[PDB]
Design an enzyme around this catalytic site. Structure first.
Site, PDB file in Angstrom:
ATOM      1  N   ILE B  35       0.749  -1.465   0.040  1.00 53.17           N
ATOM      2  CA  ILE B  35      -0.082  -0.081  -0.031  1.00 53.17           C
ATOM      3  C   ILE B  35       0.792   1.186  -0.015  1.00 53.17           C
ATOM      4  CG2 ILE B  35      -1.836  -1.171   1.100  1.00 53.17           C
ATOM      5  CD1 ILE B  35      -1.550   0.798   3.248  1.00 53.17           C
ATOM      6  N   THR B  37       4.330   1.207  -1.723  1.00 56.69           N
ATOM      7  CA  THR B  37       5.224   1.379  -3.018  1.00 56.69           C
ATOM      8  C   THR B  37       4.884   2.487  -3.750  1.00 56.69           C
ATOM      9  OG1 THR B  37       3.856  -0.598  -3.921  1.00 56.69           O
ATOM     10  CG2 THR B  37       5.801  -1.229  -2.588  1.00 56.69           C
ATOM     11  N   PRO B  42       9.981   1.486  -1.067  1.00 60.11           N
ATOM     12  CA  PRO B  42       9.900   0.042  -1.277  1.00 60.11           C
ATOM     13  C   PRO B  42       9.952  -0.886  -0.240  1.00 60.11           C
ATOM     14  CG  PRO B  42      11.793   1.321  -2.004  1.00 60.11           C
ATOM     15  CD  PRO B  42      11.430   2.313  -1.134  1.00 60.11           C
ATOM     16  N   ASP B  43       9.537  -2.032  -0.380  1.00 56.27           N
ATOM     17  CA  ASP B  43       9.300  -3.206   0.565  1.00 56.27           C
ATOM     18  C   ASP B  43      10.678  -3.837   0.990  1.00 56.27           C
ATOM     19  OD1 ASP B  43       8.657  -5.250   2.056  1.00 56.27           O
ATOM     20  OD2 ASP B  43       7.503  -6.369   0.442  1.00 56.27           O
ATOM     21  N   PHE B  44      11.234  -3.362   2.291  1.00 55.59           N
ATOM     22  CA  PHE B  44      12.425  -3.699   2.719  1.00 55.59           C
ATOM     23  C   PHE B  44      12.534  -5.131   2.872  1.00 55.59           C
ATOM     24  CE2 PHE B  44      10.891  -2.753   7.133  1.00 55.59           C
ATOM     25  CZ  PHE B  44      11.004  -3.923   7.762  1.00 55.59           C
ATOM     26  N   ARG B  45      11.478  -5.887   3.396  1.00 52.79           N
ATOM     27  CA  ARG B  45      11.436  -7.131   3.484  1.00 52.79           C
ATOM     28  C   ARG B  45      11.364  -7.914   2.175  1.00 52.79           C
ATOM     29  NH1 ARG B  45       6.950  -5.067   6.351  1.00 52.79           N
ATOM     30  NH2 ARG B  45       7.328  -4.367   8.650  1.00 52.79           N
ATOM     31  N   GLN B 115       1.358  -3.596   8.462  1.00 50.61           N
ATOM     32  CA  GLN B 115       2.779  -4.149   8.707  1.00 50.61           C
ATOM     33  C   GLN B 115       3.821  -2.935   8.359  1.00 50.61           C
ATOM     34  OE1 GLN B 115       2.312  -7.103   5.456  1.00 50.61           O
ATOM     35  NE2 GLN B 115       3.360  -8.718   7.077  1.00 50.61           N
ATOM     36  N   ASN B 116       3.171  -1.608   8.055  1.00 51.55           N
ATOM     37  CA  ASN B 116       4.109  -0.584   7.844  1.00 51.55           C
ATOM     38  C   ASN B 116       4.654   0.359   8.952  1.00 51.55           C
ATOM     39  OD1 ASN B 116       3.565  -1.529   5.267  1.00 51.55           O
ATOM     40  ND2 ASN B 116       2.269  -0.121   4.631  1.00 51.55           N
ATOM     41  N   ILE B 117       5.911   0.924   8.769  1.00 54.28           N
ATOM     42  CA  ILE B 117       6.270   1.678   9.750  1.00 54.28           C
ATOM     43  C   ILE B 117       6.655   3.117   9.410  1.00 54.28           C
ATOM     44  CG2 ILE B 117       7.577  -0.358  10.740  1.00 54.28           C
ATOM     45  CD1 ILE B 117      10.059   0.357   9.395  1.00 54.28           C
ATOM     46  N   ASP B 118       5.984   3.420   8.104  1.00 49.41           N
ATOM     47  CA  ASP B 118       6.300   4.592   7.466  1.00 49.41           C
ATOM     48  C   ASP B 118       5.359   5.929   7.985  1.00 49.41           C
ATOM     49  OD1 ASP B 118       3.476   4.259   6.227  1.00 49.41           O
ATOM     50  OD2 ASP B 118       4.444   3.194   4.678  1.00 49.41           O
ATOM     51  N   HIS B 135       4.308  -4.176  13.353  1.00 55.26           N
ATOM     52  CA  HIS B 135       5.871  -3.880  13.578  1.00 55.26           C
ATOM     53  C   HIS B 135       6.199  -2.672  14.219  1.00 55.26           C
ATOM     54  CE1 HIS B 135       6.418  -7.968  11.738  1.00 55.26           C
ATOM     55  NE2 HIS B 135       5.519  -7.649  10.628  1.00 55.26           N
ATOM     56  N   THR B 210      -0.440  -6.843   1.273  1.00 59.11           N
ATOM     57  CA  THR B 210       0.329  -7.886   2.071  1.00 59.11           C
ATOM     58  C   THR B 210       0.482  -9.275   1.330  1.00 59.11           C
ATOM     59  OG1 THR B 210       0.715  -8.992   4.230  1.00 59.11           O
ATOM     60  CG2 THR B 210      -1.563  -8.185   3.563  1.00 59.11           C
ATOM     61  N   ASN B 234      -3.997  -7.196  -4.193  1.00 63.36           N
ATOM     62  CA  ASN B 234      -2.628  -7.446  -4.066  1.00 63.36           C
ATOM     63  C   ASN B 234      -2.107  -7.861  -5.553  1.00 63.36           C
ATOM     64  OD1 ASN B 234      -0.294  -7.395  -2.198  1.00 63.36           O
ATOM     65  ND2 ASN B 234      -0.198  -9.675  -2.698  1.00 63.36           N
ATOM     66  N   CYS B 268      -2.602  -1.883  -5.506  1.00 64.99           N
ATOM     67  CA  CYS B 268      -3.663  -1.450  -4.524  1.00 64.99           C
ATOM     68  C   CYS B 268      -4.406  -0.137  -4.621  1.00 64.99           C
ATOM     69  CB  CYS B 268      -3.036  -1.119  -2.966  1.00 64.99           C
ATOM     70  SG  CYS B 268      -2.473  -2.933  -2.372  1.00 64.99           S
TER      71      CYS B 268
HETATM   72  C1  5GR Z   1       9.219   7.556   9.037  1.00 65.01           C
HETATM   73  C2  5GR Z   1      10.194   6.684   8.595  1.00 65.01           C
HETATM   74  C3  5GR Z   1      11.672   6.745   8.889  1.00 65.01           C
HETATM   75  C4  5GR Z   1      12.404   5.669   8.044  1.00 65.01           C
HETATM   76  C5  5GR Z   1      13.827   5.825   8.061  1.00 65.01           C
HETATM   77  N1  5GR Z   1      11.783   4.730   7.211  1.00 65.01           N
HETATM   78  C6  5GR Z   1      10.716   4.756   6.949  1.00 65.01           C
HETATM   79  S1  5GR Z   1       9.757   3.770   6.072  1.00 65.01           S
HETATM   80  C7  5GR Z   1      11.124   2.836   4.849  1.00 65.01           C
HETATM   81  C8  5GR Z   1      12.062   1.956   5.501  1.00 65.01           C
HETATM   82  O1  5GR Z   1      12.064   0.664   5.059  1.00 65.01           O
HETATM   83  N2  5GR Z   1      12.985   2.302   6.614  1.00 65.01           N
HETATM   84  C9  5GR Z   1      13.725   1.529   7.312  1.00 65.01           C
HETATM   85  N3  5GR Z   1      14.659   2.014   8.309  1.00 65.01           N
HETATM   86  C10 5GR Z   1      15.016   1.114   8.948  1.00 65.01           C
HETATM   87  C11 5GR Z   1      14.762  -0.211   8.613  1.00 65.01           C
HETATM   88  C12 5GR Z   1      15.394  -1.603   9.176  1.00 65.01           C
HETATM   89  C13 5GR Z   1      14.778  -2.058  10.348  1.00 65.01           C
HETATM   90  C14 5GR Z   1      15.455  -2.534  11.487  1.00 65.01           C
HETATM   91  C15 5GR Z   1      14.681  -3.294  12.379  1.00 65.01           C
HETATM   92  C16 5GR Z   1      13.206  -3.172  12.417  1.00 65.01           C
HETATM   93  C17 5GR Z   1      12.537  -2.599  11.477  1.00 65.01           C
HETATM   94  O2  5GR Z   1      11.144  -2.604  11.289  1.00 65.01           O
HETATM   95  C18 5GR Z   1      10.423  -3.389  11.925  1.00 65.01           C
HETATM   96  C19 5GR Z   1      10.319  -4.631  11.519  1.00 65.01           C
HETATM   97  C20 5GR Z   1      11.059  -5.789  11.921  1.00 65.01           C
HETATM   98  N4  5GR Z   1      10.626  -7.004  11.238  1.00 65.01           N
HETATM   99  C21 5GR Z   1      11.127  -8.140  11.118  1.00 65.01           C
HETATM  100  C22 5GR Z   1      11.319  -8.702   9.687  1.00 65.01           C
HETATM  101  C23 5GR Z   1      10.562  -9.755   9.250  1.00 65.01           C
HETATM  102  C24 5GR Z   1      10.695 -10.202   7.896  1.00 65.01           C
HETATM  103  C25 5GR Z   1      11.733  -9.761   7.280  1.00 65.01           C
HETATM  104  C26 5GR Z   1      12.406  -8.697   7.625  1.00 65.01           C
HETATM  105  C27 5GR Z   1      12.215  -8.083   8.880  1.00 65.01           C
HETATM  106  N5  5GR Z   1       9.589  -6.504  10.310  1.00 65.01           N
HETATM  107  N6  5GR Z   1       9.329  -5.121  10.615  1.00 65.01           N
HETATM  108  C28 5GR Z   1      13.306  -2.175  10.318  1.00 65.01           C
HETATM  109  S2  5GR Z   1      13.639  -0.278   7.340  1.00 65.01           S
HETATM  110  N7  5GR Z   1       9.726   5.818   7.707  1.00 65.01           N
END
Ligand code: 5GR
Ligand code: 5GR
Ligand code: ZN
Ligand code: ZN
Lengths: 300, 300
Positions: B35, B37, B42-45, B115-118, B135, B210, B234, B268
């Site tokens: 939702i 992208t 990008p999807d870091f996972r 699932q998003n942290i954005d 997350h 997702t 999706n 999406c």
């Molecule tokens: C407001 C704002 C600021 C910033 C800097 N970015 C963003 S959105 C872009 C982005 O990807 N940014 C990232 N910044 C650091 C990242 C690394 C990291 C380190 C630790 C836990 C974590 O996120 C929580 C978690 C952890 N897991 C576990 C799991 C499962 C499966 C695959 C990979 C990870 N899922 N979600 C992530 S990714 N939004």
């Protein structure tokens, strides 16, 4: 680089050497229907047992209604007729159950999470604090009235089931339901508090007699630390899943990056006996099983 | 027989007619990386983004260490360098985000699990009580010292990330960590209390962007009542899984017993625009998106 590999080999022999090392202090068992099949309790959630054929006589609106709390509360008779039909003829815990009893007595068992409702873990000597019953249990039953919640023991519920009298509460005459979790009911907060605490602490995950398909179990193996070894003892492979570094991932027994997961394919009793033998526990386990089964037979 | 079929057809058109019926009162959205992208995040996972290649410069003991709380607490510099590198260049919520805003404003949104942290759900106008961040989030950060736990806003954390100063607490000089959930950390009890309550009440599950591979999300679709329709929007099919009557089951879009699950395959934004159009919401949604994006652009 690569995170530490606590298993020297991806074999039962490797797991046993790890279990005997200083690092392996806290073991979590995740157990399912496969640990009670050798005790004569079929897997009701399996297609092979044919529970669909079992239900036709009761004339349900749909076959899934037997598992739903809303249907139970209005029409409890099918559930209790089915419960009579499926009531186990004996309650002798298996070699696998007594393997977990050895883990308890040696101070290695952090927790046993069970999908089973048959009470055999308790009969084997695991206590309430050792156990998380993921689908509840027949061990206790409760009046369904929120203002009452009178608790009844299994001996009381058994008499009602066998005599074909729909169990009613002696205080308020509401339905009395076994503490098994029907669709539409919630798990206790204890399940989640245990789960969050336990899985930060686990040094070894022993997964026995479960396909890991049904929730909440299907979420549990991914909560272990990334370096914590995971042994599956089961008839077939289970818990295998494109994610980065296989994170948020199931079991990896067979890829080239496999580093911590082992599948031992066969019956849980045979797997546990083999593991016990590697550990030097075979005589202890066989002696435990003999005396405990004898104690049960002595009361018949 | 068969349980009630709340969808008249297994199509987006069927879902829209259901949404307009009296029965569809409480909608839960389950949303992931797909939702955001189209907003340029990008999807870091995902393997496709190639985060493995991203990490080599930091010289980690192993690549998974970047996600682990124990490694972060000792060596936070790689995380914060990565966070600078991945910090989004703009924060314009997508059409999909604003579709959820319409659900909120129409009183249909029970909860959005993300699932998003954005933080884009919050920027789109969803409030704290509307949201379960599975997350965690960058929206707030905390001092990691248990005796202190000083809270810091995103504006504070952003300045630290861009200036390449490792964030330290102004009260006690401990590390300040974004409220994202690292491996080795637990979710709040709120996640599970919301989850148990919400999923007893849900009339429609909207699953958007997702793959449903990562826990805790991978457990959520099975908690809905058995008759509650489930729509996937999706790029590819997801959440499909031998169990009796497909119980304890994933999505069944395509079998002959499929009765409630629909897969709409595409982006999406395009899916949500099509759904909104069926509902008579297209102008409202396009007007909402225009004014909200303009309000954001007006502050640049
Ligand atoms: C407001 C704002 C600021 C910033 C800097 N970015 C963003 S959105 C872009 C982005 O990807 N940014 C990232 N910044 C650091 C990242 C690394 C990291 C380190 C630790 C836990 C974590 O996120 C929580 C978690 C952890 N897991 C576990 C799991 C499962 C499966 C695959 C990979 C990870 N899922 N979600 C992530 S990714 N939004
Ligand atoms: C001490 C004692 C007494 C008795 C009578 N039996 C047993 S062991 C043998 C047995 O299979 N007995 C059964 N008696 C009634 C049964 C039906 C039923 C109805 C409602 C919820 C429930 O168990 C809890 C649940 C519910 N779900 C949900 C889901 C997921 C996937 C497939 C099927 C069900 N999993 N576990 C089960 S099965 N032990
Ligand atoms: Zn009562
Ligand atoms: Zn502090």
């Amino acid at each position: 680089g690569h995170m530490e590999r606590l298993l020297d080999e991806l074999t039962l022999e490797g797991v046993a050497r790890y279990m005997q090392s200083e690092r392996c202090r806290r073991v979590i068992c995740l157990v399912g229907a496969g640990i009670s099949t050798s005790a004569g309790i079929p897997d009701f959630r399996s297609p092979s047992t044919g529970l669909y054929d079992n239900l036709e006589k009761y004339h349900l609106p749909y076959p899934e209604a037997i598992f739903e709390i809303s249907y139970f509360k209005k029409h409890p008779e099918p559930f209790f007729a089915l419960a009579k039909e499926l009531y186990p003829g004996q309650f002798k815990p298996t070699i696998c159950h007594y393997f977990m009893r050895l883990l308890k007595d040696k101070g290695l068992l952090l927790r046993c999470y069970t999908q089973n409702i048959d009470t055999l873990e308790r009969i084997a000597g695991l206590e309430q604090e050792d156990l998380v019953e993921a689908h509840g249990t027949f061990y206790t039953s409760h009046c369904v009235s929120a203002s009452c919640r009178h608790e009844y023991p299994l001996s009381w519920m058994k008499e009602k089931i066998f005599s074909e009298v729909t169990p009613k509460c002696e205080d308020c005459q509401s339905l009395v339901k076994p503490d098994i979790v029907f669709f539409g009911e919630s798990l206790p907060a204890r399940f989640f508090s245990c789960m969050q605490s336990d899985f930060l602490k686990v040094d070894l995950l022993l997964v026995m007699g479960t396909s890991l398909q049904v929730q909440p179990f299907a979420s549990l193996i991914s909560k272990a630390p990334l370096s914590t070894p995971r042994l599956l003892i089961n008839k077939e492979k289970a818990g295998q899943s494109g994610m980065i570094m296989g994170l948020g991932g199931g079991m990896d027994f067979d890829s080239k990056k496999a580093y911590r997961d082992v599948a031992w394919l066969g019956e849980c009793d045979q797997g546990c006996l083999a593991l016990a033998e590697l550990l030097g526990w075979k005589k202890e386990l066989e002696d435990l099983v003999r005396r405990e089964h004898a104690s049960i037979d002595a009361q018949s």
